[PDB]
Enzyme design. Structure first.
Site, mmCIF file in Angstrom:
data_model
loop_
_atom_site.group_PDB
_atom_site.id
_atom_site.type_symbol
_atom_site.label_atom_id
_atom_site.label_comp_id
_atom_site.label_asym_id
_atom_site.label_seq_id
_atom_site.Cartn_x
_atom_site.Cartn_y
_atom_site.Cartn_z
ATOM 1 N N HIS A 8 38.350 159.463 52.791
ATOM 2 C CA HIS A 8 36.928 159.120 52.800
ATOM 3 C C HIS A 8 36.487 158.500 54.123
ATOM 4 O O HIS A 8 35.286 158.300 54.341
ATOM 5 C CB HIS A 8 36.589 158.233 51.581
ATOM 6 C CG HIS A 8 36.780 156.764 51.784
ATOM 7 N ND1 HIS A 8 37.831 156.066 51.224
ATOM 8 C CD2 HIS A 8 36.020 155.844 52.426
ATOM 9 C CE1 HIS A 8 37.728 154.790 51.543
ATOM 10 N NE2 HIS A 8 36.642 154.629 52.276
ATOM 11 N N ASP B 220 43.139 160.045 48.260
ATOM 12 C CA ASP B 220 42.339 159.519 49.364
ATOM 13 C C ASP B 220 43.267 159.216 50.543
ATOM 14 O O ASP B 220 43.599 158.068 50.842
ATOM 15 C CB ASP B 220 41.577 158.278 48.925
ATOM 16 C CG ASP B 220 40.525 157.856 49.919
ATOM 17 O OD1 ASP B 220 40.234 158.641 50.862
ATOM 18 O OD2 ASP B 220 39.975 156.744 49.749
ATOM 19 N N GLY C 10 34.960 148.334 55.348
ATOM 20 C CA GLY C 10 35.389 148.262 56.731
ATOM 21 C C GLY C 10 36.892 148.172 56.902
ATOM 22 O O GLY C 10 37.406 148.447 57.997
ATOM 23 N N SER D 195 38.754 150.049 54.798
ATOM 24 C CA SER D 195 39.157 151.371 54.329
ATOM 25 C C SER D 195 39.980 152.117 55.360
ATOM 26 O O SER D 195 39.675 152.109 56.557
ATOM 27 C CB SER D 195 37.911 152.193 53.979
ATOM 28 O OG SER D 195 37.306 151.666 52.814
ATOM 29 N N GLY D 196 40.994 152.821 54.867
ATOM 30 C CA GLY D 196 41.911 153.573 55.696
ATOM 31 C C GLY D 196 43.066 152.778 56.242
ATOM 32 O O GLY D 196 44.027 153.383 56.741
#
Ligand SMILES: [Ca+2]
Length: 223
Positions: free
Chosen positions: A40, A84, A175, A177-178
């Site tokens: 995402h 994801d 922020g 994320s990943g």
């Protein structure tokens, strides 16, 4: 990261910032040419920023390398966030030293109760917005699959795990994320989603990296 602490400059040497004019997601360096992040977080034409502490100040250990290719997992579903995970290849190899280093992929899946290090430049407030400039850290346990599913009925797949604190107060956030969840020195999770941040009975939900090691290795071997 809500309720965490200031990591310290380059203490998380595999943490990268994905930049498209601004930081928008984290990622983890897994070899000198590849980064793993959340699907995402996909977008075209981004620059990977390694060796970062303060993402708004040039401090002298940065490596900025544009992405040559993004590969979103073949089964990524953005509605459910199942799978994801995404791989990002760098146009050139990063130079690896103590402050920029890859993180090892897991050989097994970490159990609930294992303490892990979660990090990122995301929001530090659960009711409000304050984005930090230096990298923030959180030490937090993997939660049981049963408490994960009870917190998020109908939403937790076998490619997800929960980590954090059912009482709230400490969590990852927008922020982050990943970015990485690292346990016993291996990359076990990717910051994926959650309902709000640091809310009671709504812990962080993470991509279960151990399910994807064969796909990551085979993909890296052919791209
Ligand atoms: Ca910097």
């Amino acid at each position: 990261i809500v309720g965490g602490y200031t990591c310290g400059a380059n203490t998380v040497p595999y943490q990268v910032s994905l930049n498209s004019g601004y930081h928008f997601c984290g990622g983890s360096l897994i070899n000198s040419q590849w980064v793993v992040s959340a699907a995402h977080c996909y977008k075209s034409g981004i620059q990977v920023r390694l060796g970062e502490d303060n993402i708004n100040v040039v401090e002298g250990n940065e490596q900025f390398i544009s992405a040559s290719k993004s590969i979103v997992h073949p089964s990524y579903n953005s509605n459910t966030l199942n799978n994801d995970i995404m791989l990002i290849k760098l146009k050139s190899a990063a130079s690896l030293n103590s402050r920029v280093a890859s993180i090892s992929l897991p050989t097994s899946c970490a159990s609930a109760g294992t303490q892990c290090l979660i990090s990122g430049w995301g929001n530090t407030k659960s009711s409000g917005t304050s984005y930090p400039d230096v990298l923030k850290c959180l030490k937090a346990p993997i939660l049981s699959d049963s408490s994960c599913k009870s917190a998020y009925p109908g939403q937790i797949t076998s490619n997800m795990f929960c980590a954090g604190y059912l009482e709230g107060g400490k969590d990852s956030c927008q922020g982050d994320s990943g970015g990485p969840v690292v346990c016993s020195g291996k990359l076990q999770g990717i910051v994926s989603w959650g309902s709000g941040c640091a809310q009671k009975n709504k812990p962080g939900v993470y991509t279960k990296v151990c399910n994807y090691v064969s796909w990551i290795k085979q993909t890296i071997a052919s791209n």
